[PDB]
Amino acid sequence: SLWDVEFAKQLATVNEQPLQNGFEELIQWTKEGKLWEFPINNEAGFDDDGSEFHEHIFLEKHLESFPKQGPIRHFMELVTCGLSKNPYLSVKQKVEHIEWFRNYFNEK
Amino acid sequence: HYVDWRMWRDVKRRKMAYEYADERLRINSLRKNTILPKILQDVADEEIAALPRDSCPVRIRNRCVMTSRPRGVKRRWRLSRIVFRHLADHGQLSGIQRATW
Amino acid sequence: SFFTKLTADELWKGALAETG
Amino acid sequence: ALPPRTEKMAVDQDWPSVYPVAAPFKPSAVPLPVRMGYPVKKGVPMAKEGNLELLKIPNFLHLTPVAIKKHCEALKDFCTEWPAALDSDEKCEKHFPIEIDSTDYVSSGPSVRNPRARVVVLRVKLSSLNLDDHAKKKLIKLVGERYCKTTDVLTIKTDRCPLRRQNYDYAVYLLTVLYHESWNTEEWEKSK
Amino acid sequence: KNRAARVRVSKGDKPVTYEEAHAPHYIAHRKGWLSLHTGNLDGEDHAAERTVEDVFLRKFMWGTFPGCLADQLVLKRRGNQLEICAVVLRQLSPHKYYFLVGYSETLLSYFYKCPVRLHLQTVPSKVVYKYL
Amino acid sequence: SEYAFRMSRLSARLFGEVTRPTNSKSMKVVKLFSELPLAKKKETYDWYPNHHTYAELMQTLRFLGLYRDEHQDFMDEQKRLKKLRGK
Amino acid sequence: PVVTISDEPDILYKRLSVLVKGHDKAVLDSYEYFAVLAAKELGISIKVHEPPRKIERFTLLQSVHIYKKHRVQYEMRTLYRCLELEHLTGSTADVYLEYIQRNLPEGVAMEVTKTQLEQLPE
RNA sequence: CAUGAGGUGGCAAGAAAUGGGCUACAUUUUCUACCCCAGAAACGAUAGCCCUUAUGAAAUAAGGGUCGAAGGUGGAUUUAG
Ligand SMILES: [Mg+2]
Numbered sequence: 001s002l003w004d005v006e007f008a009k010q011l012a013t014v015n016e017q018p019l020q021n022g023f024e025e026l027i028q029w030t031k032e033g034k035l036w037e038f039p040i041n042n043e044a045g046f047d048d049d050g051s052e053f054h055e056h057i058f059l060e061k062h063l064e065s066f067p068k069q070g071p072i073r074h075f076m077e078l079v080t081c082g083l084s085k086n087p088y089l090s091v092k093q094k095v096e097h098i099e100w101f102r103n104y105f106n107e108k
Numbered sequence: 109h110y111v112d113w114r115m116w117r118d119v120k121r122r123k124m125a126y127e128y129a130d131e132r133l134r135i136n137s138l139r140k141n142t143i144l145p146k147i148l149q150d151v152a153d154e155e156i157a158a159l160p161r162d163s164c165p166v167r168i169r170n171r172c173v174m175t176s177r178p179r180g181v182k183r184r185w186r187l188s189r190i191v192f193r194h195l196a197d198h199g200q201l202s203g204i205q206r207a208t209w
Numbered sequence: 210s211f212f213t214k215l216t217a218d219e220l221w222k223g224a225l226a227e228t229g
Numbered sequence: 230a231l232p233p234r235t236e237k238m239a240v241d242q243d244w245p246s247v248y249p250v251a252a253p254f255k256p257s258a259v260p261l262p263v264r265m266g267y268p269v270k271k272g273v274p275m276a277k278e279g280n281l282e283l284l285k286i287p288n289f290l291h292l293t294p295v296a297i298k299k300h301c302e303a304l305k306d307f308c309t310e311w312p313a314a315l316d317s318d319e320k321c322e323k324h325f326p327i328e329i330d331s332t333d334y335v336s337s338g339p340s341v342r343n344p345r346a347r348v349v350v351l352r353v354k355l356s357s358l359n360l361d362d363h364a365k366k367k368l369i370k371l372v373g374e375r376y377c378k379t380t381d382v383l384t385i386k387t388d389r390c391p392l393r394r395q396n397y398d399y400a401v402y403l404l405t406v407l408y409h410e411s412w413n414t415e416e417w418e419k420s421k
Numbered sequence: 422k423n424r425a426a427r428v429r430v431s432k433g434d435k436p437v438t439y440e441e442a443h444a445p446h447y448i449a450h451r452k453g454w455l456s457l458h459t460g461n462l463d464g465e466d467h468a469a470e471r472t473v474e475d476v477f478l479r480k481f482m483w484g485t486f487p488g489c490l491a492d493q494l495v496l497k498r499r500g501n502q503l504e505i506c507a508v509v510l511r512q513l514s515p516h517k518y519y520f521l522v523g524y525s526e527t528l529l530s531y532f533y534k535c536p537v538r539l540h541l542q543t544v545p546s547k548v549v550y551k552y553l
Numbered sequence: 554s555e556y557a558f559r560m561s562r563l564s565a566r567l568f569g570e571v572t573r574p575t576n577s578k579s580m581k582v583v584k585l586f587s588e589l590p591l592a593k594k595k596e597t598y599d600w601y602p603n604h605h606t607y608a609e610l611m612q613t614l615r616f617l618g619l620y621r622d623e624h625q626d627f628m629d630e631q632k633r634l635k636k637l638r639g640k
Numbered sequence: 641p642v643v644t645i646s647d648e649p650d651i652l653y654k655r656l657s658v659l660v661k662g663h664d665k666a667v668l669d670s671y672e673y674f675a676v677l678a679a680k681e682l683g684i685s686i687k688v689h690e691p692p693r694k695i696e697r698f699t700l701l702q703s704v705h706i707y708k709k710h711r712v713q714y715e716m717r718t719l720y721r722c723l724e725l726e727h728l729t730g731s732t733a734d735v736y737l738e739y740i741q742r743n744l745p746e747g748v749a750m751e752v753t754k755t756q757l758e759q760l761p762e
Numbered sequence: 763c764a765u766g767a768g769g770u771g772g773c774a775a776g777a778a779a780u781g782g783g784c785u786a787c788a789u790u791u792u793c794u795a796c797c798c799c800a801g802a803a804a805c806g807a808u809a810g811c812c813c814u815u816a817u818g819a820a821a822u823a824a825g826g827g828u829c830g831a832a833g834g835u836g837g838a839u840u841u842a843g
Contacts, residue, residue, distance in 0.1 A: 082586020457747030
């Protein structure tokens, strides 16, 4: 419904007044999304697709199948631990890394 | 539109590093063990060698952003001790005042 | 570059060389 | 066009409306005859109507005491007063065990992504936990550099995952699992 | 003879402004810092990035406002803000200035993803501190 | 001590980190995975900011007539003079 | 206007510490005063102390070329101010923060707010 | 169509002279404890040599063995407080 949208726009225009004050301007900015939402989080966004710690840290699931007695498995475990320790890499990235490693292993 | 050719080269190197970093890291991990076989390690090393230079992280040299000079460059501001000084004197850096001591 | 550039007065001074 | 809003300013006035939000100096706006600068050898500190120094000053022309008071009054809403859980932190401890305490930094500039803010520790008193006999002996053993002996305070710190809330959750879980482990004695234990 | 920012005594003719007429050793003493941001406090991050931006901005302003800056700018930041105080000469028509200002605000905002709102200071002549 | 060792192992298990015993050499890998690599850091890849963008934009502005590289103008003038001359 | 009230329990903050870093002392003092004025008005028990100033110093060459002895040294000072707030409801605390954080001075003044939860044991 | 630009490899080793450092040449010392009531001894510490470790695509640093120089308080002169 483009007509509806147009009507809405018109209504909005009708409603409008100028900036009035500094406070008003600030409010407008906030509404837009230019200014920050106080008090500051250092977070807003960056949600990592609803991970909840175990997805980051406990990599028994993402470890996948391979022989569980050899040095290779030890290495994999170490890698997993390292990944867990990591903050900056996402959930996806670690998984991708693991996959790559697996592929490499398969190739040999 | 960078300051000189050296700067451009550096930038290119940085870009390369960014591109190929993960792979490099993986290869290093593969290499740097006493765990797991020797042949595999050797193979990894070979692979690393094969991978192109400038993607190497060590070739990344620090210069000043403004004047392309490698030395006297504070890593806090990424500018040369001449440019930085110039900035400081006029008063264009907040906090930076002369050490009367 | 853009940062390698500077103000005109300085340039003029450089050109002139009226200060040995 | 004159020095406007100064010559025609009322003696005794709603000042908070003239400077509501924080802004620069504007000597035309300001009524005070402030002279800011180092005096010339035989002269005066520099005049109001064209100083950089004044501009440079971070300023509190907004937030005049009266204005502040007004603001406070306005914001008596938004503010549910806390109950009679009392001062001294004894009562609180008795009622609320555990002390989580994560920080958050407010830097300037376009980005707000500061890693340091994510970190969280969980300082909980061991005596206030109040459900451990043999587990007191085991918990301590488990948890090396944490647990002060002068004041019995377990203090797990979580730095792994990116978000703060998730870190907190992990810490909580870590604590719980630890407790469980302490409670549930193993067979090999006997070789002391 | 150290001779950084200090403008030189040639005669009794050189008209010099207060920021311009004070040597770098006075920065905390008889002067103030032009830029103002959290970066250079310690421990704190993103100073280098800021510095470049600051360098850019002044230059940009100069380019835009040619023969319409009496003295050097004052750059300020408050979270996600980038306030500027420019001391301008009453040379051009106000309409032109207005046109310029909005444009600058928009362009800068789009560049740095930060709502700029510069405020000007109209002064007929350069405010002389010394005839050096 | 065996008991102590066991306790340590348990602790390790609890706190995610390396459970099975190993060397200082193999911990390198772990460290690497914990960290970002040097090349992926925001200090490194974005050390020099854009530059090209800064120049080009300025040039565009100049062309338009909303900005004036005085230095550039001077250079142009010099070039013109040279052309007039010798060259 | 328009506040509303949720049915859920409000979060409890204990001894909420706030550390203000600043280049200039007078400004910092002013800020502290403002904070005091605010908190008291609100109905919040607070106190203030000034932990010691830090001064990172560093030296560089006075010349462009050669002349090694002749150096110029800089310093970038930072002074601190505590703003530890004794006992409050979470919403109130948030409001206070908002009041403070929005209108703090530019560049100079940077606060670090160690909030402190309590909660039930699990 | 080069005093411009990009790639691969390389370039630095001393017959010597001289400047400024470090370390000694020992008993006010050397080693060990302790960081100032002790007990032993009658040095010096490179140069290499091998062996690790760190770094890093790739060996410069760090440690361990081995060895164990000259030097046995310095001339005219001169440096700092
Ligand atoms: Mg001198």
